[PDB]
Amino acid sequence: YISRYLTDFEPIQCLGRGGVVFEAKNKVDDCNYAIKRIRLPNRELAREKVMREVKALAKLEHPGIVRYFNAWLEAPPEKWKVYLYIQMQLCRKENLKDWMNGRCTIEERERSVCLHIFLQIAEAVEFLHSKGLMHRNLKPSNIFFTMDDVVKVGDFGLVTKLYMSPEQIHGNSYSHKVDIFSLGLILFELLYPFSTQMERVRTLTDVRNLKFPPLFTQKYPCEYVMVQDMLSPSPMERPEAINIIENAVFEDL
Ligand SMILES: Cc1cc(NC(=O)[C@H](O)c2cccc(F)c2)ccc1-c1cn(C)c2ncnc(N)c12
């Protein structure tokens, strides 16, 4: 037995860890892809549950969704069981976190470029919600850029907490509102740069509890009302993905 992945791609490196994610140039077409290797569940309703998802995911086409290419199953003989591969468009190694941690002044955070980036993330989330799907992984380490500076939501589907909503932590991610919450923090962190890791944690932890820096509440007064809405502590209160994109602040960017 020889595995499909090993014959057809020469691996470059590992990009992710949690399933594993590799970089690998396909030999036929000579382009480098992001490849997610999941070890599958051993049960026969846990297997089939997943395989109904890869079917629904592979149908997704949107500008904020990393471009899909292929999926295939393998089952090799271990030396001492059944891995699923997903070939996805490779993305720039510099994610949203990197981008933010490299621009720490109000000046390097232009109000125009920031709202632009955020809208794309919001529009991608609108799409997924309208398809009856939810992200549940919105956070800067997992918001990406394409070679051509297009923003993409990161990995989701196929089954830190500072960007998780409360219910998500102690509950069952119950509603698609958990994504509205995540967007709130992300919008703030874009418009209010940090100096130190401590500052970031202390201030986000506070903004989870609606304790905002007054300098922010002054500087961006509209944005403040949005981030408040998006954080409304009773889930059912928060806006819908659609409502956020239709907010006045997004007009003639
Ligand atoms: C591994 C990975 C997977 C996805 N999967 C999906 O969106 C989503 O599962 C999906 C599947 C199928 C169709 C469909 F529409 C959507 C998105 C992003 C990355 C990614 C992570 N890391 C660390 C990366 N590093 C460089 N490039 C990268 N693509 C990545």
Author numbering: 585 to 602, 605 to 666, 881 to 959, 987 to 1080
From the primary publication:
The protein kinase R (PKR)-like endoplasmic reticulum kinase (PERK) is one of three endoplasmic reticulum (ER) transmembrane sensors of the unfolded protein response (UPR) responsible for regulating protein synthesis and alleviating ER stress. Upon activating the UPR, PERK phosphorylates eIF2a at Ser51, leading to widespread inhibition of protein translation with a few selected regulatory proteins translated to restore homeostasis and alleviate ER stress. Herein, we report the synthesis and discovery of a series of novel mandelamide-derived pyrrolopyrimidines (I) that are highly potent, selective, and orally bioavailable PERK inhibitors. These medicinal chemistry efforts were iteratively supported by an X-ray crystallography structure-based approach to develop and refine SAR information.
Hydroxyl substitution on this group was found to increase potency by 2-3-fold (13 vs. 14) with preference for the (R)-over the (S)-enantiomer (11 vs. 12). Compound 11 formed three hydrogen bonds directly with the carbonyl of Q889, the amide of C891, and the carbonyl of F956 from PERK, respectively. In addition, compound 11 forms two hydrogen bonds with a water molecule, and this molecule hydrogen bonds to the amide of V652. In the ATP binding hinge region, substitution at the C2-position (R1) of the pyrrolopyrimidine ring appeared feasible, filling a small pocket near C891. Compounds 11 and 24 were screened in the DiscoverX scanMAXSM panel of 468 kinases. The resulting TREEspotTM interaction maps revealed that the methyl substituent in 24 led to superior selectivity versus 11. The S(35), S(10), and S(1) selectivity scores at a concentration of 1 µM were 0.005, 0, and 0 for 24 versus 0.072, 0.035, and 0 for 11. Given the superior selectivity of 24 but slight loss in potency versus 11, further optimization of the series was carried out with the 2-methyl substitution on the pyrrolopyrimidine ring to further improve potency and drug-like properties.
